[PDB]
Amino acid sequence: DQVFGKVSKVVCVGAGYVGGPTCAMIAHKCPHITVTVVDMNTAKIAEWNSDKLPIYEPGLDEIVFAARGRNLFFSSDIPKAIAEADLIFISVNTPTKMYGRGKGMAPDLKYVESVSRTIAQYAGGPKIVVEKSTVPVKAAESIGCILREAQKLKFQVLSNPEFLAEGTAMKDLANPDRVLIGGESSPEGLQAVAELVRIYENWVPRNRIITTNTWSSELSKLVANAFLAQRISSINSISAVCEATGAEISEVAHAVGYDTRIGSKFLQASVGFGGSCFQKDVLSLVYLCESLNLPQVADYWQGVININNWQRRRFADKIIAELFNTVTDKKIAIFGFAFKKNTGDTRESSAIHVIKHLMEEHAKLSVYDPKVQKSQMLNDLASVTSAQDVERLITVESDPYAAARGAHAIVVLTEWDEFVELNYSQIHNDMQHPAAIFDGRLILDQKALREIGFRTFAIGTSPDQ
Amino acid sequence: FGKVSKVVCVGAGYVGGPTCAMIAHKCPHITVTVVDMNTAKIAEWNSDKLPIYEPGLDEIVFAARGRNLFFSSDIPKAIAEADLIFISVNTPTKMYGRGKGMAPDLKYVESVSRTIAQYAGGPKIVVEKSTVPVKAAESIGCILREAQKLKFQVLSNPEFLAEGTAMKDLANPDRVLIGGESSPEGLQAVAELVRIYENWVPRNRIITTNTWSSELSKLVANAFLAQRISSINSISAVCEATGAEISEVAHAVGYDTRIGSKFLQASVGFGGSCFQKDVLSLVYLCESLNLPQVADYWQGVININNWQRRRFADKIIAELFNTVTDKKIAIFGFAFKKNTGDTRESSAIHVIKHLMEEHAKLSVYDPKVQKSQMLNDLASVTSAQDVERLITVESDPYAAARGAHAIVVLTEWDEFVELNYSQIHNDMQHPAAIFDGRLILDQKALREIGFRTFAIGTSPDQ
Amino acid sequence: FGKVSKVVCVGAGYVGGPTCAMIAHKCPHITVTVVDMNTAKIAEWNSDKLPIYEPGLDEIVFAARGRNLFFSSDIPKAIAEADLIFISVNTPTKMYGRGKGMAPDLKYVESVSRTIAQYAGGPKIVVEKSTVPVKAAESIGCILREAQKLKFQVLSNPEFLAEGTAMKDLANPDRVLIGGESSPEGLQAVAELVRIYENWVPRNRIITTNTWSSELSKLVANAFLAQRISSINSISAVCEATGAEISEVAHAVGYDTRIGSKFLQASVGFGGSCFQKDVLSLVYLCESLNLPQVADYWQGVININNWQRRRFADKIIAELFNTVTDKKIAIFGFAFKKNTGDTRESSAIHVIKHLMEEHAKLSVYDPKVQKSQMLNDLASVTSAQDVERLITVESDPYAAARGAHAIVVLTEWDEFVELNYSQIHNDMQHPAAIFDGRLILDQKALREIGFRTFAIGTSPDQ
């Protein structure tokens, strides 16, 4: 009684960082399947169809340009792709709600819903529908309900979470730690799961494909990200203890990370974690727990976010304090803006939030980042303050020496390699005196900077041994 | 300082004995004495029956005892001869006063530090081996300097050691951790202790730090471990509420190699003598430092553990109509984990106590734990009176289950899997209920027999 | 389920006795048997002196007993033969554990259910007569379902009886309420109980609902009644502060026909075995459903009751120079309301307790409550030793009042009005105070005698 047969036609709705690369891998490993990536952004589709792909990922040019026009297609004709597909990935944003119930915590399902309604309209036959972009738990229930309405057509909804990072996407897709698939505990559900497993089996060992119920798969994505962020918050909390006692956080992280049950990854203390994943997913899970009347669990995971914001705040406090509790019109140089090194991504960057704290104190801020666009920077800061306030307080530099010049303080907020072995003796010389340096990323040599004559601070080190 | 040929350790229990046995084993040229005021414990160490059971410890001790391993109760004398001294006594938790329930009582560390001060003779290296609160070396350091008003350095070298794998763990440790003073004299004494470990441990696995980094590392490491468990336990309740399954989640999550798959077993809650103690010790530290933000964060780990136990008992009570006065319920398991009779901080103790507060009649079976050990443990969290009134103890699980209204599994013993649960069901009160705090039983199998069946991290209704 | 001909009630108390007597009385064809474990109580029911006094009850019982009404201690036999079984047992409040002080204990309801399951034999209709928590019927049903692997339905038929008017309440009820399962078999079972009641109750006063609506309706009705008293009592304090009179307010408010004129008597506070119990049951239910807003809303009724007693006692203590150690205070009234010996949740108990905490010497007079009941009541909220020290019980109000500094009316007995308050004033300590917690005395008259006089709901300084 076979309702879903072998998939030969795959569509992904959403041509962004998740959808594009994932489809490309499918087309590359599965020459028998037609894969079409659709998006109503006709300019972005034109980019994927051009000689310069809209994202840079190592290995991706080779893949897309070999397959495009053969078994990989990029189109803006969404109804036609939907009508012809056997399996449809949904790869859209779930922006955080800005107002109302779950403000600042709940994912907004408007795009997911929009795609589901389009599939309902244009499907024509039985489809497997697959949640690829991060969703709140029970999103598949909402999708299911939208699709079931059109069955007056058979649909199964699967969860297949992404585990991609920027810069390593092709390696992450070609050699994943695991592939996770969740579906309905039902015969039709098992059939649909099996057809998606069959796709991945083309290139992924069966024992690295993990199949679960739909809710476990959706939950596992949030929880995995929560566990990672918890590691960072746990170490960052201990950084304050080190500061208070004369222990060293670099030394504790080493000793702790050598237990094989804990592991040595994600144990770098910092001014705090950033990016479009960690806070968003931890807050999604908090909101979920609140909504389930599990306030104890909610409070437990909120602590991850509490520590992160406390790290950022207490770091800025220390800058404000050491500058005599007064910084109106006073020049401070920020080294770094992007949420981590080696990107232009600013989403949830600790730098945005530390700078905001210093803008409150009316500081005059000179920002340098190797990669982030000037326009992006000024838009970011405006969104958390005002266009007026950044006009007043914010100068962006294309040079680190131009930022540090005549500043009372240096603050390193992104861990760029090029900040290590700047000419710090010269920086010292052209600063105000006494001169202060704050290392939020633990990349600088404390001993050397001390010898140069800086008042020098790092997270996780006591100021006086 | 001062190359080291004579090593002494004060305290002859689960840390100091096994540690000294391994040092002698892998360094023949070092004479190792273990000292202790309990002469009968020293007698046990010098007999054919050693006082503690470690796998492969007998044959390490017997092939070294008399040769370069020595058990004495002459504490002053071994102190007098030594180059390097380990301190390996308890720091039981304060029972009252400042840090009641949280702060380690430094009274044995103090006693021994004062004994070192008297009967010294020369320069010593003094090493904290058993778990201490951070800056306990300051307190040792201060006692010892009142003898040199004789040239000391105090060192931290924490234990990383499970029961039943102590020999395995000593011979092939994940890491060896040593801290001392940041000074020429301090860096000397670190090197001299490094030397000893280099005799059998790769230099790459030997980490050296300052004293506080090392003291703090021990507590934080156990804190990270407990946190993984409380984290997954927190998620077990999400699973119950959504229809997700905790086994499926831990599986998916653990395959991230940055997270790892160890310590993601959900349960009624963690136990044993290190986890809660070290977490609370860390919570106390952070309070003392005016870091209330950090104290709250770590207290969360304990809060969830306690909450996991409370909510499991609440489910048992609720299922049995919110009334369990004089109702029979069987408890399968009492030890804090399987394959031991150690009951320290056991979740079984606390879930039974919650059930005793409702005046439940409780028949306990554990395969290993002594009847005397059980009744005394339950007494110390309740009363000798209440345990007399409420607790029976069986050495047959089938006798516990006979006439019971509920079965409650609290320890993950393998024998609890595939008892005759069809028989058990028939000899129970009906409706019959079973509650799995350890995720070892087959839910679909129990359902089909006709149990009303519950497991942590699984939704009741499918 | 056939037309019912044998009715059993398990529980021979204030509810089951009278209700069965009325059924037996109005339904000559039906054999009614009241059963109880308490052989002495059944003995009383079989004697020339029934164990309760109700107007009209003797006439009904003595005419029917041994014809179609029987009182037995043979529960298994009666269960066996019944078509329809009423459960009329206490659900005393949990004294420990989950819901302590708030949740009803279903132990007796469980007891009876398991006896029904054991001894039934055929189809039974099983009817919750005494007040149960919502979902009690589910727990009943789960016990009875296990037995039929016998054909059971569980109904709710709440009691609306009051002491002193039980026979009129039963013969001419405001409404009869029955809830059953949302099922053909459920609707059948309801029809058979509705047929029993249609023998004397018009059909338009018989109300049929689902089981949960019925169980809930009982608690909510008593909660609404208690709320009226706490509402008017909250306003009594506003009267005192402004110069309004509570008696005038109650009369004006009560003349609105949508409000109604009943249960608007201000007092030192409501009591009895129903009001606090059922509100606190409702409050516990709300907490259990995660409706903390509704829980808090209903807790307000009890908060005001307790605050009314507390503030009245505070007024006594303040007037008496804020010191009452060794100082004699006379208490007029101990029963929860006039014309009864029932003391359960009596405001007098809690006001006397407050006064005992200040080591006042209380001489208590009630026309009806027994000395031994009084002493035992007071001991249960203090101690046997406290009551021997502080409490004297008198058989005469002038004896109580002699040498007193205060008089305190706590129960609205008619004999307290038009005692000789001139003579009382003369024999008191001076200044002499009087406090009317029941609004039965003449304030002007007492003022004229020279009392410092106070009443709830009247401003002291006119």
Which residues make Cβ contacts (< 8 Å) with residue A100, sequence separation at least 6? none
Distance of alpha carbon B445 from alpha carbon B439, whole angstroms:
14
CB count in 10 Å sphere of residue B212: 25
Question: Do A288 and A408 belong to one domain?
Answer: yes
Distance of alpha carbon C263 from alpha carbon C259, whole angstroms:
10
Distance of alpha carbon C288 from alpha carbon A268, whole angstroms:
44
Which residues make Cβ contacts (< 8 Å) with residue A124, sequence separation at least 6? A83, A153
Q: Do A256 and B221 touch (CB under 8 A)?
A: yes
Query: Rg of chain B's alpha carbons, rounded to an integer?
Result: 25
What CATH number should be reported for the domain holding residue B217? Answer: 1.20.5.100
Residue reference for tokens 């006798």: B399
Active site residues of A: 277
- Give the single-character DSSP code of A261: T
Q: Which two tokens stand for residue A109?
A: 């399902």
Task: Report the gap between the CA of A317 and the closest CA in chain B (Å).
Answer: 15
Q: Which residues of C are annotated as a binding site for NAD(+)?
A: 11-16, 36, 41, 89-93, 130-131, 163, 274-277, 344
- Rounded to the nearest 5 degrees, what angle is found at the Cα of A250, between the Cα atoms of B208 and A427? 125
Coil vs helix vs strand at A107: strand
CB count in 10 Å sphere of residue B418: 10
Q: Which two tokens stand for residue B272?
A: 């044993």
Note the Cα C370 to chain centre separation in Å.
18
Q: Which two tokens stand for residue C137?
A: 């019927």
8 Å CB contact between A349 and A384: no
Question: Do A358 and A440 belong to one domain?
Answer: yes
> Hey, of A234, A248, A281, A305, which one would you mutate to test binding to chain B, going by the most B CBs within 10 A of its CB?
A234
Which chain C residue lies closest to B360 (C-alpha atoms)? Answer: C97
8 Å CB contact between A67 and A49: no
| Backbone angles phi and psi of C124, in degrees to 5 | -130, 135
Coil vs helix vs strand at C260: coil
Coil vs helix vs strand at C84: strand
Distance of alpha carbon A288 from alpha carbon A274, whole angstroms:
21
Task: Provide the domain count of chain C.
Answer: 3
Question: Do B344 and B382 belong to one domain?
Answer: yes
Residue reference for tokens 């796709």: A199
Closest alpha carbon to C265 in C243, C235, C297: C235
8 Å CB contact between A138 and A218: yes
Q: Which two tokens stand for residue C322?
A: 């804020």
Coil vs helix vs strand at B367: coil
Question: Do A145 and A203 belong to one domain?
Answer: yes
Q: Do B431 and C96 touch (CB under 8 A)?
A: no
> Hey, of C98, C109, C114, C142, which one would you mutate to test binding to chain B, going by the most B CBs within 10 A of its CB?
C98
Distance of alpha carbon A347 from alpha carbon B331, whole angstroms:
52
Distance of alpha carbon C350 from alpha carbon C267, whole angstroms:
14
Host H or E run for residue C57: helix C57-64
With the C-alpha atoms ordered B65, B66, B70, B75, is the resulting torsion angle positive or negative? positive
Provide the terminal-to-terminal Cα distance of chain A, rounded to the nearest Å: 75
- Give the single-character DSSP code of C204: G
8 Å CB contact between A289 and B242: no
Q: Report the DSSP beta bridge partners of residue B70.
A: B33
Host H or E run for residue C87: strand C84-87
Question: Do B197 and B329 belong to one domain?
Answer: no
Q: Check the annotation: does B341 bind a ligand.
A: no
| DSSP letter for each residue of C218-231 | HHHHHHHHHHHHHH
Ramachandran assignment for B201, one of left (phi > 0), alpha (psi -120 to 50 degrees), beta (any other): beta
Distance of alpha carbon A373 from alpha carbon A425, whole angstroms:
28
What CATH number should be reported for the domain holding residue C326? Answer: 3.40.50.720
With the C-alpha atoms ordered A104, A107, A113, A115, is the resulting torsion angle positive or negative? positive
Host H or E run for residue C111: helix C107-119
With the C-alpha atoms ordered A24, A27, A30, A33, is the resulting torsion angle positive or negative? positive
Within a 13 Å sphere around the CA of A267, how many CA atoms are in the beta-carbon half? 21
Which residues of chain B neighbour C146 with C-beta distances below 8 Å? 430-431
Distance of alpha carbon C52 from alpha carbon C209, whole angstroms:
32
Q: Which two tokens stand for residue B205?
A: 């696995």
Q: Of A167, A197, A213, which marks where a domain is finished?
A: A213
Question: Do C55 and C188 belong to one domain?
Answer: yes
Q: Check the annotation: does B344 bind a ligand.
A: yes
Question: Do C323 and C427 belong to one domain?
Answer: yes
Distance of alpha carbon B167 from alpha carbon B25, whole angstroms:
11
CB count in 10 Å sphere of residue C170: 25
Which residues make Cβ contacts (< 8 Å) with residue B168, sequence separation at least 6? B55, B56
8 Å CB contact between A157 and A140: yes
Q: Which residues of A129-168 are buried (b: 16+ CB within 10 A; e: fewer)?
A: bbbbbbbbbbbbebbbebbeeeeeeebbbbbbbbbbebee
Q: Check the annotation: does B187 bind a ligand.
A: no
Task: Report the gap between the CA of B141 and the closest CA in chain C (Å).
Answer: 50
Question: Given strand B406-409, what is the order of strands in its sheet?
Answer: B391-393, B361-365, B328-332, B406-409, B433-436, B452-455
Q: Which two tokens stand for residue A51?
A: 């000689």
Scanning A294-373, the segments in alpha helix (DSSP H) are 295-322, 350-360
Which residues of chain B neighbour A178 with C-beta distances below 8 Å? 252, 255-256
Number of helices and strands in chain A (H, E): 18, 14
Distance of alpha carbon B146 from alpha carbon B117, whole angstroms:
8
Coil vs helix vs strand at A335: strand
- Does the N-terminal peptide bond of residue B97 adopt cis geometry, omega within 30 degrees of 0? no
Task: Report the gap between the CA of B216 and the closest CA in chain C (Å).
Answer: 39
Helix (H), strand (E), coil (C) string for A372-403: CCHHHHHHHHHHHCCHHHHHHHEEEECCHHHH
Which residues of chain B neighbour C107 with C-beta distances below 8 Å? 323, 325
Which residues make Cβ contacts (< 8 Å) with residue A26, sequence separation at least 6? A10, A33, A35, A199
Which residues of chain C neighbour B433 with C-beta distances below 8 Å? none
8 Å CB contact between C457 and C287: no
Question: Do B255 and B348 belong to one domain?
Answer: yes
Q: Which residues of C are annotated as a binding site?
A: 11-16, 36, 41, 89-93, 130-131, 159-163, 218-222, 258, 265-271, 274-277, 336-337, 344, 438
Residue count of chain A:
465
Question: Do C286 and C407 belong to one domain?
Answer: yes
Distance of alpha carbon B300 from alpha carbon B228, whole angstroms:
12
Our CA dihedral for B353, B356, B362, B367, rounded to 10 degrees, sits at 10
- Rounded to the nearest 5 degrees, what angle is found at the Cα of B201, between the Cα atoms of B196 and B205? 115
- Rounded to the nearest 5 degrees, what angle is found at the Cα of C145, between the Cα atoms of C142 and C149? 145
Burial of C391 (C-beta count, 10 Å sphere; 0-12/13-18/19+): buried
Q: Which two tokens stand for residue B128?
A: 């904290």
Q: Which two tokens stand for residue C81?
A: 């033969």
Resolution of the experimental model, in Å, one decimal:
1.9
With the C-alpha atoms ordered B73, B75, B80, B85, is the resulting torsion angle positive or negative? positive
Distance of alpha carbon A463 from alpha carbon B152, whole angstroms:
27
Estimate the crossing angle of helix B347-356 against helix B292-319, to 10 degrees: 60
Q: Do A255 and B174 touch (CB under 8 A)?
A: no
Q: Do B325 and C103 touch (CB under 8 A)?
A: no
Distance of alpha carbon A353 from alpha carbon A334, whole angstroms:
12
| Backbone angles phi and psi of C335, in degrees to 5 | -65, 160
- Give the single-character DSSP code of B48: S
Provide the terminal-to-terminal Cα distance of chain C, rounded to the nearest Å: 68
- Give the single-character DSSP code of C93: B
The structure was resolved experimentally with X-ray
Residue reference for tokens 């050495």: B395
CB count in 10 Å sphere of residue C461: 4
Residue count of chain B:
462
Ramachandran assignment for C439, one of left (phi > 0), alpha (psi -120 to 50 degrees), beta (any other): left
Estimate the crossing angle of helix C292-319 against helix C275-288, to 10 degrees: 140
- Rounded to the nearest 5 degrees, what angle is found at the Cα of C342, between the Cα atoms of C338 and C347? 70
CB count in 10 Å sphere of residue B41: 18
Note the Cα B222 to chain centre separation in Å.
10
Our CA dihedral for A46, A51, A52, A53, rounded to 10 degrees, sits at 60
Question: Do B276 and B369 belong to one domain?
Answer: yes
Distance of alpha carbon B300 from alpha carbon A298, whole angstroms:
11
Distance of alpha carbon C348 from alpha carbon C338, whole angstroms:
12
8 Å CB contact between A333 and A404: yes
Q: Report the DSSP beta bridge partners of residue A439.
A: A412, A458
- Give the single-character DSSP code of C153: E
Which residues make Cβ contacts (< 8 Å) with residue B153, sequence separation at least 6? B1, B125, B126, B180, B181, B185, B186, B188, B189
Scanning B157-263, the segments in alpha helix (DSSP H) are 166-171, 184-198, 211-242, 246-254
Query: Rg of chain C's alpha carbons, rounded to an integer?
Result: 24
Q: Do C107 and B323 touch (CB under 8 A)?
A: yes
Host H or E run for residue B397: helix B397-401
Residue reference for tokens 């730690």: A177
With the C-alpha atoms ordered B414, B415, B420, B422, is the resulting torsion angle positive or negative? negative
Estimate the crossing angle of helix B211-242 against helix A214-245, to 10 degrees: 160
The CA–CA distances, whole Å, from A169 to A23, A25, A340, A432, B175 equal: 12, 10, 17, 44, 34
Task: Report the gap between the CA of B318 and the closest CA in chain C (Å).
Answer: 9
- Give the single-character DSSP code of B127: E
Distance of alpha carbon C105 from alpha carbon C111, whole angstroms:
11
Distance of alpha carbon B306 from alpha carbon A428, whole angstroms:
53
Q: Of B210, B232, B264, which marks where a domain is finished?
A: B210
Estimate the crossing angle of helix C107-119 against helix C136-147, to 10 degrees: 30
Which residues make Cβ contacts (< 8 Å) with residue B303, sequence separation at least 6? A296, A300
Which residues of chain B neighbour C99 with C-beta distances below 8 Å? 322
Which residues make Cβ contacts (< 8 Å) with residue C381, sequence separation at least 6? C349, C350, C353
Task: Report the gap between the CA of B455 and the closest CA in chain C (Å).
Answer: 21
Residue reference for tokens 């009982």: C218
Q: Of A245, A262, A297, which marks where a domain is finished?
A: A245
Q: Provide the residue range defining the domain that includes A17.
A: 1-213
Question: Given strand A34-38, what is the order of strands in its sheet?
Answer: A72-75, A34-38, A9-13, A87-90, A127-131, A155-159, A179-183, A209-213
Q: Check the annotation: does B162 bind a ligand.
A: yes
Q: Do A247 and B303 touch (CB under 8 A)?
A: no
CB count in 10 Å sphere of residue A268: 17
CB count in 10 Å sphere of residue A103: 11
Distance of alpha carbon A300 from alpha carbon A294, whole angstroms:
10
Q: Do C105 and B325 touch (CB under 8 A)?
A: yes
> Hey, of B322, B325, B326, B353, which one would you mutate to test binding to chain C, going by the most C CBs within 10 A of its CB?
B322
Question: Do C39 and C157 belong to one domain?
Answer: yes
Closest alpha carbon to A140 in A198, A91, A182, A92: A182
Question: Do A209 and A221 belong to one domain?
Answer: no
